[PDB]
């Protein structure tokens, strides 16, 4: 049975959207192959996203994916929240509680703020972009009081792009007014690499300095440059390259074609594209459920128009709500387990750290089986040569 | 000569409504008198509001007013930015140099910092609503920095109103 679904993705990002078409190829079973409505439309419009949001709805399709800004997330979780049709997203999570949303990005403030912890901070900075939302920024705040902190945070994108070249000279010389050795950059990779030659014209990434990446895409970076500049540098990686389940993929994943499927020939991969990846293994699996549930939901656009006042939408899409979150499985983020408000549970962070050779993990972090730190190399029982320090 | 205007009013905000309806009387010429049309909805949910929006964009009216939440204003920037239709409201403003938005309400951050300076603070907590925006938390932190102020900023809008007596 083909399954109409949504198709919503930003321009520029067809890596994920070729990550995306990687999965319609590998989850497509006999049963039932899904009907994708691609839209590579703007995200920061919410009229360019009402209309291609109110065009899937006159499909009648039963789950959408896509992205959102943090001006269109007000847009999709008042819509999907009135108009009963379950959202998937890679992108950051709402605050609210929001019904029909599924998102793809675990929370990465509780492994933020137990990093902290481990390196036992008192006063550093934190730049933060605001196109994310500014909940870690309130997260680490509740926390400033409470672990009794002097955070320095200044917003970074206010920075027009012509001339973020004279700012930041500005900029970290206002840090240098304190002399901030510890930062903690909250960007995207772009916006990351963006700050981190901003680091290299100065030159301040020598030994002394240290600083935290707050994205899940550490090993997105341009880790090369700053890896023999001095400074240390810790971050967040979600694609644990290490894992056969992950090397299998890119075994598959770099022997593409680059020019069909442009970013798919590196050996890399963005987490966006790894939980796009992962969106389609938890959709597919789904409606292998909802096919063994045999709840038939054979809709034509009887939804129709989004302006139907009142509209009330067909109510099978809530049990189809309840079921993508009790989908419980493994994938490119470790295990996959949903809350009922559809934030991500069970789930694993693995702690990177920059090192001479490279990234290099130190341990993980979990929801309640929180940060433990991973060693071995010796496995023990050895004489331990106590430094004296004098 | 009838003049077709948007009505957007939250629900129980009718004291700003019984305003607006006393500078229909004072200010209704003989030239032209304004059409309202005046729809009680929720702010909150932008599906509610463009669905308000779009009964008075099929209106053609020529200004809307109304007010909106942190929520509703990404929708209201996005569409009357695109759909050309000028708006009004006494709303906390926004960061975005917005066309066809227009904001009855003064931006307060240069009294409030030029305030903190008149009684020389150096530490201080700052309880703040999530509702209006964080951009008066984002100009007191640029401050802070700047005028070397130790700010205690803490959230208060995240407490539920059932048990908003023990936290």
């Not at 959207?17 to 995200?43: K, W």
Request: charged content about 25%; aromatic content about 10%.
């Amino acid at each position: 049975n083909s399954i109409q679904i949504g198709g919503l993705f930003p321009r520029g990002a067809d890596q994920e959207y070729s990550a995306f078409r990687v999965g319609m190829v590998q989850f497509s079973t006999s049963e039932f192959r899904l009907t994708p409505h691609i839209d590579n439309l703007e995200v920061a419009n919410s009229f360019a996203v009402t209309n291609a949001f109110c065009s899937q709805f006159s499909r009648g399709v039963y789950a959408i994916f896509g992205f959102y800004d943090k001006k269109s997330v007000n847009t999709i979780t008042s819509f999907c929240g009135t108009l009963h049709v379950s959202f998937i997203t890679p992108s950051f999570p709402t605050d609210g509680t929001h019904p029909f949303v599924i998102q793809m990005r675990p929370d990465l403030k509780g492994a933020l703020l137990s990093l902290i912890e481990y390196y036992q901070w008192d006063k550093f900075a934190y730049l933060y972009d605001s196109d994310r939302g500014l909940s870690t920024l309130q997260a680490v705040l509740d926390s400033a009081a409470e672990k009794k902190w002097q955070v320095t945070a200044i917003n970074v994108g206010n920075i027009n792009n012509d001339k973020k070249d004279e700012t930041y000279r500005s900029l970290f010389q206002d840090l240098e007014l304190k002399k901030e050795r510890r930062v903690i950059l909250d960007c995207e990779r772009d916006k990351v690499n963006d700050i981190v030659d901003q680091v290299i014209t100065i030159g301040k990434h020598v030994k002394g300095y240290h600083y935290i990446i707050a994205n899940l895409g550490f090993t997105d970076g341009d880790l090369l440059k700053i890896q023999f500049g001095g400074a240390e540098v810790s971050g967040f990686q979600i694609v644990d390259y290490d894992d056969s389940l992950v090397s299998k993929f890119i075994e598959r994943w770099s022997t593409l074609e680059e020019k069909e499927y442009p970013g798919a020939h590196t050996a890399t991969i963005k987490y966006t594209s790894a939980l796009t990846y992962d969106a389609v293994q938890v959709m597919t699996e789904a409606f292998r459920n909802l096919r063994k549930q045999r709840i038939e939901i054979s809709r034509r656009g009887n939804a129709g128009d989004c302006l139907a006042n009142p509209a009330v939408p067909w109510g099978q899409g809530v049990e189809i709500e309840r079921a993508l979150k009790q989908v419980q499985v493994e994938g490119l983020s470790g295990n996959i387990k949903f809350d009922q408000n559809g934030k991500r549970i069970n789930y694993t962070i693995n702690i990177m750290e920059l090192k001479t050779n490279g990234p290099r993990k130190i341990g993980y972090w979990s929801e309640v089986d929180k940060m433990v730190l991973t060693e071995d190399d010796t496995s023990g029982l050895e004489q331990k040569t106590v430094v004296v320090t004098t």
